[PDB]
């Protein structure tokens with residue numbers, strides 16, 4: 001019964017994770033957009049002292065999101081939110097019930113967070129070399145069930161954790177967004193269209209086909225425009241190695 | 242009934258996390274040391290293709306750990322293992338039952354992984370300035386309940402995840418092990434003994450006082466000697482400014 005408010009921003013793949021899980025849960029929830037990178041509201045540290053999107057409040061009296069209550073629980077970190085939503089909505093089966101299959105979900109999230117995410121950040125924001133990103137993506141693809149299906153077989157929060165990033169990669173590459181070189185952009189576009197990455201392309205299509213993605217995605221062009229508002233995506237800057 | 246084999250190394254805080262959780266669960270399990278950093282066995286990629294410790298096998302026929310079975314489940318990534326052990330031993334209450342308290346546990350793990358561990362890596366392996374690490378530790382300390390207790394109140398896997406690192410910090414600093422200068426070593430030692438960090442000292446005492454720590458710790462001096470075998474800690478080497 002307790003209220004859920006998710007503080008969001010369209011560009012943010014971390015916020016996108018949580019919107020997907022809340023859709024899959026069938027939750028009733030409120031979203032509130034926050035201009036976190038250019039004009040953070042003075043009240044925002046009340047909902048997340050770390051000053052990062054997403055932020056979540058849970059319970060407390062029903063209040064406008066820009067008037068957060070001291071009584072609501074303040075939940076930070078997107079992966080913690082994903083597990084929280086699975087705990088709140090057990091009948092939605094956002095995780096498997098078998099312990100080994102649940103571990104596949106948790107391992108997939110850790111592989112992404114520990115080996116892939118930092119490579120996306122460094123290639124796009126620092127223009128570091130793309131080969132280590134492609135290697136990490138090939139590793140992650142190797143963890144998928146080979147024949148089809150999601151990270152743990154049935155859909156789970158592991159797929160909510162990963163699709164925001166994989167789904168942004170393709171249109172960001174096509175629009176030329178990111179500080180990497182022309183040469184590395186060509187390399188990544190050819191690699192991600194190559195037979196080497198057929199399995200992860202099917203994974204992206206399968207995740208994108210679900211209503212939880214369609215209803216939380218602004219469209220490729222619109223997401224590209226939101227990403228262009230991010231200060232660390234400095235237009236006209238590229239790094240070369 | 243299904244066997245658990247943890248591939249371990251004394252120096253490894255990541256392996257230590259999982260030993261602590263297995264002890265708290267009252268599990269039956271085997272540990273098998275692996276010289277992962279200097280002489281990895283040719284069979285080790287069969288249990289973990291990432292070639293990292295810890296690695297875990299689950300189920301399958303009982304076999305010597307250096308002859309792993311293709312029938313066992315191969316589980317990678319320490320935090321996935323911690324969640325797996327909680328799933329396997331629900332009567333051990335390795336997580337809270339209440340969703341909000343469980344979220345405090347997951348959030349504390351994510352704060353450590355996302356903001357603290359990388360600062361430990363920078364300071365100890367690169368000798369970068371200590372101030373950002375102390376700031377990250379103050380943030381993590383601020384997430385603890387101020388009046389006492391563990392991360393989520395009662396002990397949970399969140400405390401298994403974090404104590405291996407905090408417990409190594411003090412004796413490593415006493416030994417001067419790591420690429421930071423004497424000047425920053427003194428600065429860290431003074432800071433961690435100061436009133437600023439009284440709450441995290443209480444936390445380290447409370448975690449270390451549990452049998453799960455005593456039974457999985459070689460002793461301060463012995464743990465320092467194991468850490469000196471780690472190539473990336475470059476015993477005898479320090480960077481300055």
Ligand SMILES: COc1c(O)cc(O)c2c1O[C@H](c1ccccc1)CC2=O
Pocket residue numbers: 011012013014117120121122124125164165166168169172227230
């Ligand atoms: C501002 O957008 C973000 C963000 O808020 C947080 C991030 O870590 C990233 C990011 O854009 C880049 C990107 C590349 C490819 C796929 C998804 C995202 C790099 C990245 O890693």
Ligand SMILES: COc1c(O)cc(O)c2c1O[C@H](c1ccccc1)CC2=O
Pocket residue numbers: 252253254255358361362363365366405406407409410413468471474
């Ligand atoms: C070699 O041991 C390891 C390791 O296997 C993985 C690590 O991330 C670290 C580490 O030693 C350093 C260290 C500092 C303070 C406390 C625990 C550990 C830095 C660190 O971050």
Ligand SMILES: N[C@@H](CCC(=O)N[C@@H](CS)C(=O)NCC(=O)O)C(=O)O
Pocket residue numbers: 011012013014015036051052053054076077078079355
């Ligand atoms: N690990 C966090 C990361 C959240 C994050 O970095 N959010 C960015 C927007 S995509 C932000 O809000 N602020 C950037 C900053 O100040 O660190 C999570 O998983 O929720």
Ligand SMILES: N[C@@H](CCC(=O)N[C@@H](CS)C(=O)NCC(=O)O)C(=O)O
Pocket residue numbers: 114252253254255256277291292293294295317318319320
């Ligand atoms: N995220 C992994 C980290 C595991 C890890 O990095 N282990 C180190 C020992 S502490 C290793 O075995 N190898 C480091 C390397 O591959 O060079 C976990 O949580 O289990």
Ligand SMILES: [Ca+2]
Pocket residue numbers: 142143144
């Ligand atoms: Ca595979």
